[PDB]
Amino acid sequence: VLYVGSKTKEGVVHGVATVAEKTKEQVTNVGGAVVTGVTAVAQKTVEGAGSIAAATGFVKKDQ
Amino acid sequence: VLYVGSKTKEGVVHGVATVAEKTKEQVTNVGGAVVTGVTAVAQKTVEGAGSIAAATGFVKKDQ
Amino acid sequence: VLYVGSKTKEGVVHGVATVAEKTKEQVTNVGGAVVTGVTAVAQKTVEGAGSIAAATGFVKKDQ
Amino acid sequence: VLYVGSKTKEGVVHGVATVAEKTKEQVTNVGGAVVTGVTAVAQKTVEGAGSIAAATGFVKKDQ
Amino acid sequence: VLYVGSKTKEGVVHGVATVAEKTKEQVTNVGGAVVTGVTAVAQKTVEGAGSIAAATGFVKKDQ
Amino acid sequence: VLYVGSKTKEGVVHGVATVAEKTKEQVTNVGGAVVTGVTAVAQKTVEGAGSIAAATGFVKKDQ
């Protein structure tokens, strides 16, 4: 491959405006992955799993 | 590969404005991964798992 | 590979403005990973796991 | 005009997020009023005409 | 006009986030008023006309 | 006009975040008023016209 005078944007996030107001939030997490709120994310991944919330573990919550 | 006079943006996050106001938040985490609030993230990962919240552990919460 | 006169941005975060106001936050973490507040992060990772909140441990919270 | 235990907002502007990017702007003003960009304004009492763009006055442009 | 135990906001501007980026701006002003960029303003009482751009006055531009 | 146990905000500007980046700006002013960049202003009482850009006065630009 070759590149000559040639721009290249990969995994880019731009121009994001937000206004949260009187938000109420309650999270109860047990061995999981939780993502909340405002979240701009630009994730280039190579030879590997790209994720915002990954839950791979073991949870025993018996009764 | 070769590059000549050639810009290249990878995993870039720009231009982010936010206004949180009278937000209330409660988190109860037990062995997990929690991410909240405002969160600009630019994550180039190579030969490895890219994630904002990863939960891989063991949790025993019996009763 | 070669590079001639050629800019290269990887894992870059820029231009972030935020205003938090009268925010209330309560966290109860037991053996996990919690990230809150305003969080600009530029994470280039190589041959390793890139994450903002990683929870890999063991938690025993029996009753 | 009494007030007892009573919150009161008069003339308020809050919670504003904006993102300009690669904007180009050219102004040629001759004896006028020009206002550009982001503009929060709050005025409780005003003893006149309220207006965003008010053009009184004389312009002579003969040829 | 009594006030008892009573909060009161008059003429207030809060919570403002902005991001300009690669902006280009050219102004040619001749005897006028130009206002650009970010502009929070708060005025409780004003004994006149309230306005963002007010153009009174005389302009003679003959040819 | 009595006040008893009573908070009061009049003419206030708070909580402002801004980010300019690679901005280019050119002004040619001849006998006018130019205001650029970030501009928080707070005035309780004003005995006149309240305005962001006010252009009174005479401009003669014959040819």
Question: Main traits of this protein?
Answer:
homohexamer; 63 residues; mainly beta; 7 strands; flat; Alpha-synuclein (chains A, B, C, D, E, F)
Shape of chain A: flat
The assigned structural class of chain A equals mainly beta
H/E element sequence of chain A: EEEEEEE
Number of helices of chain A: 0
Helix-residue proportion of chain A: under 10%
Major sheet size, sense and barrel closure of chain A: none
Count of DSSP strands of chain A? 7
Approximate strand percentage of chain A: over 45%
Largest interface: A-B, 63 and 63 residues
The multimeric state of the shown protein is homohexamer
Query: What Rg of chain A is obtained from the alpha carbons, in whole angstroms?
Result: 19 Å
Subcellular location (chains A, B, C, D, E, F): Cytoplasm; Membrane; Nucleus; Synapse
Modified residues (Phosphoserine) (chains A, B, C, D, E, F): 51
Binding site for Cu cation (chains A, B, C, D, E, F): 14
Organism (chains A, B, C, D, E, F): Homo sapiens
3D structure, described in words:
Chains A, B, C, D, E, F: Cu cation binds at residue 14. Chains A, B, C, D, E, F: The modification Phosphoserine is found at residue 51. Chains A, B, C, D, E, F: Belongs to the synuclein family. Chains A, B, C, D, E, F: Residues 1-31 are annotated as: 4 X 11 AA tandem repeats of [EGS]-K-T-K-[EQ]-[GQ]-V-X(4). Six copies of one chain form a homohexamer. Chain A is mainly beta and 63 residues long. Chain A has strands at 2-4, 9-21, 24-30, 33-35, 39-46, 50-55, 58-60. Strand 5 of chain E pairs parallel with strand 5 of chain F, so a sheet runs across the interface.
